[PDB]
């Protein structure tokens, strides 16, 4: 039984090399937003006519 | 020359016989409407959609 006192632990080692880059399916932070204002009335029916 | 005193002029003779009908190409008074509010966007291009 090792006692585990307050120096026992040690940081974690992170991997070397080159920096990550995003590999998320869509920008997140970035991401623009063209908007429109959509009445009551004429209900979500079809999304190509709203782009 | 025949004198135009104020009794000779007498009013006319409207003709007689059953009532008249009406005959516009659309009704004026009656007619109905069903109204919705267009935006700013989307101009009219198309007029069976919005019917």
């Known amino acids: 039984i090792e006692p585990f006192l307050r120096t026992t632990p040690r940081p974690l080692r992170l991997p070397d090399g080159p920096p990550c880059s995003q ?23 079809i999304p190509l006519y709203d782009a």
Request: hydrophobic content about 35%.
């Open 23 to 45: 590999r998320s399916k869509f920008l997140l932070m970035d991401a623009l937003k063209l908007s429109i204002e959509d009445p009551s009335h004429e209900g979500e029916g």
